[PDB]
């Protein structure tokens, strides 16, 4: 009874960062060593836990929040950070516990002519709360005038696509990011290592 990490990491499609996909993992054995020692990740950064002791600590739930962002923005997926992703798409709490895993998927996601199927939020009335998932497409009102469903001056579509191309430099290449949030509640603690 192993945890379905294959369904997260080997997925055909990944969600846009503005609408990240939260998969709940429970009642299983999480063989974290498979991921840690895979050496297929460019980023594997753990907060609150040691990356080689992940097997020993049990959790109530493990949440795999999966999304696609560009390289330069990978550094924003961290507690205490600010920026377009950290504030308007996916924000981690200052006391976040878990591991942030990311890898370069340029040869999988980039398309000739640009892959524009991945979007992020640019405009929001306020910053997100930790783990808040805002997927509204309502036109952003930058001014004092209602947009009434019409784009124009001070009326913007809140989302924009990433131009992922095979000729992009690394900072503009797509990365697949999975954040494994470790939650410990008043609970039996069902997810543990082998």
């Amino acid at each position, epitope marked *: 009874n192993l945890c379905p990490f294959g369904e997260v990491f080997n997925a055909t499609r990944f969600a846009s960062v503005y609408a990240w996909n939260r998969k709940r993992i429970s009642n299983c054995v999480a063989d974290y060593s498979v991921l840690y020692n895979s050496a297929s990740f460019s980023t594997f950064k753990c907060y609150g836990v040691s990356p080689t002791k992940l097997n020993d600590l049990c959790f109530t739930n493990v949440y795999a929040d999966s999304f696609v962002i560009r390289g330069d923005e990978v550094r924003q997926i961290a507690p205490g950070q600010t920026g377009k992703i950290a504030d308007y798409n996916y924000k981690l709490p200052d006391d976040f516990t878990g591991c942030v895993i990311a890898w370069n998927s340029n040869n999988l996601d980039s398309k000739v002519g640009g892959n524009y199927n991945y979007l992020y939020r*640019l*405009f*929001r*009335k*306020s910053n997100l709360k930790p783990f808040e998932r805002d997927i509204s497409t309502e036109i952003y009102q*930058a*001014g*004092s*005038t209602p947009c009434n469903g*019409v*784009e*124009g*001056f*001070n009326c*913007y*579509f809140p989302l*924009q696509s990433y131009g992922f191309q095979p000729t992009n430099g690394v900072g503009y290449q797509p990365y697949r990011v999975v954040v494994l949030s470790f939650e410990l509640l008043h609970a039996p603690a069902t997810v543990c290592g082998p």
Partner: antibody
Amino acid sequence: VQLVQSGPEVKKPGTSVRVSCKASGFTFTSSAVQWVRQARGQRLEWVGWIVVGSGNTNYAQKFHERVTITRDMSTSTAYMELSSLRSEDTAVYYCASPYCSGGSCSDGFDIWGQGTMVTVSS
Amino acid sequence: IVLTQTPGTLSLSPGERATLSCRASQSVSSSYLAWYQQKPGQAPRLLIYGASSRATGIPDRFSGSTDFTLTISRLEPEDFAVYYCQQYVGLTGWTFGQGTKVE
């Protein structure tokens, strides 16, 4: 709160001109920039505009085919390039934006650049 | 769209009041119409936006209102400039009127 425009340019017919405006004192990345041009003694003509955050552009039909507007966050600068210059293009080009602070922007173009003359000549 | 700005030239001495007219070729949202003042040799500044709201720094000598006008309750020597109307309706097709020169 100012929008500082680049200097004057002299170009040959058929070539391109690059003009730019650097914003300071306000949240450039939340604003939008429009470009207009004025021949001496004439009315203002609209050229096009860009939303700084989005990178989305729209152009006047008269120039559309040969005009491109871009921007770069790292220098808080908006750029415009007009290709295939014609002698009749000689004009002073201006840029403008609304004032933005935090999540709120003004409801009109309060911030204007100084204007740059672009001359197309032999 | 075509914005018709009249008169070509408005001749009126200081101390008096004036009205400038910008006539749209169709109904337009008042929220997207604005007036600018260009003192010759300088970039224009915003006076009125949203058809009726004063821009920051604009004195009570001016006020706003298819027929849009600029209301000048009183003219002082620095209020003699070329006034333009602008339409921001939609994403494209923004235009200016010819401009009224007030002397």
